[PDB]
């Protein structure tokens, strides 16, 4: 797939600094949806503000995990059924911590945001469509983790 190459190429400069980029994604996420901030609790404590999440080793370690899973999707872009069961398993962990299916879109918007900003003029409408398609495939795989 030429479009798989668009994904792989677009991901290259992100993957070399996954924490800085994932930090953009999550900063965006809490700027769009501050109500997601309490879902991330460590020591039991609640982040008061979005910048508090950024000073937390556990939360930064969470970011790198997410960025690893997106990397795994990229690695497997040309089939993706090779990750299906992992992603479904990831989905039921999300159900169990109380995330809604409806939150998926804001995380995807946060990811696309982060890519557009990183790539600038290199984030062609073809690149964007390819990412939306990839993120959608990952979300449908995860959604089964609700039953599906
Ligand atoms: C529906 C929007 C989402 C919300 C609100 C959400 C929220 C969360 C929360 C609250 C956790 C647990 C945090 C913790 O206790 O440390 C988590 C874990 C995780 N998330 Fe998400 N998430 C969403 C979508 C996604 C997507 C699309 C991906 C990747 C494609 C993803 C990747 C991960 C990974 C890899 C973990 C670690 C799971 C584990 O430790 O077993 N999340 N997410």
Numbering used by the authors: 3 to 150
Extract from the study:
Neuroglobin (Ngb) is a member of the globin protein family that is expressed in the brain (∼1 µM) and the retina (∼100 µM) of vertebrates. It is involved in the protection of the nervous tissue from ischemic damage via a still-elusive biochemical mechanism. Notably, Ngb is also a hexacoordinate protein in the ‘deoxy’ ferrous form, with the rate-limiting step for ligand binding being the spontaneous breakage of the distal His(E7)64–heme bond.
Crystal structures of NgbCO in the ‘dark’ state (no illumination) at 40 K and of Ngb*CO obtained under continuous illumination (‘light’ state) at 15 K were determined. Upon refinement of the ‘dark’ state NgbCO, the occupancy of heme-bound CO is estimated to be about 90%. The partial CO occupancy is owing to the intrinsic instability of CO-bound Ngb crystals, which tend to dissolve upon full ligation. We therefore avoided prolonged CO soaking, with the drawback of not achieving full ligation. In this work, we only utilized crystals with at least 90% CO ligation, as assessed by its occupancy in the determined structures [Fig. 3(a)]. The presence of photolysed CO in the protein matrix, which was not visible in the Ngb*CO structure, was inferred by the full recovery of bound CO in the ‘dark’ structures collected after illumination.
